[PDB]
Structures are given as C-alpha cells and as structure tokens.
Amino acid sequence: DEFEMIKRNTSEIISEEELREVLKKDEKSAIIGFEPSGKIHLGHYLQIKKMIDLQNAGFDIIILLADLFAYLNQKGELDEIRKIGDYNKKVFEAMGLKAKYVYGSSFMLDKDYTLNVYRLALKTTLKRARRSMELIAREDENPKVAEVIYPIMQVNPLHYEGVDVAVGGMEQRKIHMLARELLPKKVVCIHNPVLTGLDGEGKMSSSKGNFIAVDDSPEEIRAKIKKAYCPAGVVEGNPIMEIAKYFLEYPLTIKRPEKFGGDLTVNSYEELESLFKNKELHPMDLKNAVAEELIKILEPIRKRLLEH
Length: 308
Ligand SMILES: N[C@@H](Cc1ccc(CC(F)(F)F)cc1)C(=O)O
What we know:
Blueprint: H1 2-7, E1 12-14, H2 16-24, E2 29-34, H3 42-56, E3 60-65, H4 67-72, H5 78-94, E4 100-103, H6 111-121, H7 126-132, H8 146-154, E5 165-169, H9 173-182, E6 188-192, H10 218-227, H11 239-247, E7 252-254, E8 264-266, H12 269-277, H13 283-306
Parallel strand pairs: 2-3, 2-5, 3-4, 5-6
Antiparallel strand pairs: 1-6, 7-8
The protein binds 4-(2,2,2-trifluoroethyl)-L-phenylalanine.
Residues 31-35, 64, 66, 69, 136, 154, 159, 166, 168, 172 line the site of 4-(2,2,2-trifluoroethyl)-L-phenylalanine (TFQ).
C-alpha cells in the first residue's frame, strides 16, 4: 500500500482519511522546514527518509531552509545562517533527495507575508504561543519576544499554498495543532518520532551534543555507540534500539562469536525486540551490529560530502 509505506514509522498522521484523498490525485506536494544546523544528524535523516517515501509515492517535495526561523531562535546572524543552510542542502542531496529548496527569507519579508503574521498575532494568545514552543525554543532564563513570533510565522498560510502534506517531528505538534485551527485550507500533518540522544537523557539534539552525525567517521560512530546508554532487556528509551528500528534493513544478520551464541539472523525489528527484551541478545552484540550497519548506511553520504 502506498498509504502504509508512508505511515510506516510515523508517530501520527492528521488525518488518515484526508491522506487517502490526497493520494488519489495526480499532483500532490509535501513540505518540510528545517532551521539550518551546523551538523546534520540521524534526527534529520529520519525525516528526509520520510520525504523520500512521499517522493516514491508521487509527491513533489519542497524543503524550506527556514533561515529567519533560526534567526528568531537565536542561532546567529542571517547570512551566516543562510550559509549553514547551503551546506545542509548539500547533505540532503547526498541523502538521495530529489527536492526543491527554498530560503525562508526570499519570501518571508514580503508585505503580504508580514500582514498575515500581524493578522495571526491577533488570534493567537501569548499562553498558547508559549506552550507551543516548549520543545523548540532555545534555552533562555529571560524569554524574548522573538519566541512567540516564531510559531505564528510557522502557521502563516503562505507557507502552505498548493501544499497537501506537511511533515515534521513530534516536538512540532502543538505548533501544527495551532495551524490546524487557523489555516483556511487543511494540510495533512505527518509526524515522525523524536529520537532519544545517545546518553538516554533527553532527545537527540545539535546543541545537546548527544547525536550521531551523518558525516561522522567510522571510528567516531563506533565510539559514540560504544558509550551509548543501552540497558540489557530495556527497549523504551534505548537509542541503540531506536536506530535498529528506524534505520536498519531486515532480515538482519548479527555476527557474534560462537561463545556468545554464534551468528544470529533476525527477520524483523519486532523479532529483534523480543530477542533483546528477554536477553537472548546482549547490548554489545547489538551495538556491534548497529555500529556496523550504521557505518555502511552512512558511507555513501560521507563519501559525496567528502568528494573533491
Ligand atoms: N520549527 C521547525 C522549522 C520550520 C518548520 C515548518 C515551517 C513551515 C513549513 F513547513 F515550512 F511550511 C517553517 C519552519 C524547526 O524546529 O526546525
């Protein structure tokens, strides 16, 4: 099913009935926005993989390099942000994405864009804007006015003209709930889960420095994975298991020494999860398998980012 391919590994689709209608049409487009990021990590790639799914299913793909948004979220000066955006777009092309790339600031300063922001600032409460940003806003002991403008710009109808589907992480869902209420035409949201960071502390993050970057060296992936929170028998909160779920190909053959049980062949992640949960498979053989298949999945991307 095209539908079930798109739905595989998302946390929610709002809504499924509207997505079946979109899939019927001959012309459909899907958008995702990203604040430019100094490092692109597996959190980014999970979402790019969803966009490749939509692209296989017939959708035109639009990537918004959300530079002004990064600007409001205190990531720096704009033309410095627009140069990080340029690099991120190289990375997304090396992931195998066939898309159109738009810089926010190329249209977000237009008079009609600006008037919608003022119009929406009239319908949106300070309390709701702030709630909507709890998972997104840069850490700040004295919150700035910029924090409450960010979500109203994210739900501006100009971002969604001729767009059927928006894709984002679950950390964006309150902002999308706002847009569901306030947008003139309905857009389907597809939310992808948030990856746990390597120490299990919170969520994977370019500023928490708890991530694996797609351009990481092999030795580097090994060392991050070796150090990673992965309690025996525990799946919930375990970032090594998450990587197994969202990134690996099954059936999976796990090489191990014959004293640890010999080569193991798992035909599904659900099979891996039962093996792991009852301790027929130890963190260390998991880790070696995950590290080794992660290296092979990332290699072509590291290669073209390094080509020259
Ligand atoms: N909040 C996102 C960035 C963002 C996501 C979505 C949009 C609207 C749209 F998706 F681009 F159309 C604008 C910016 C993030 O946290 O990177």
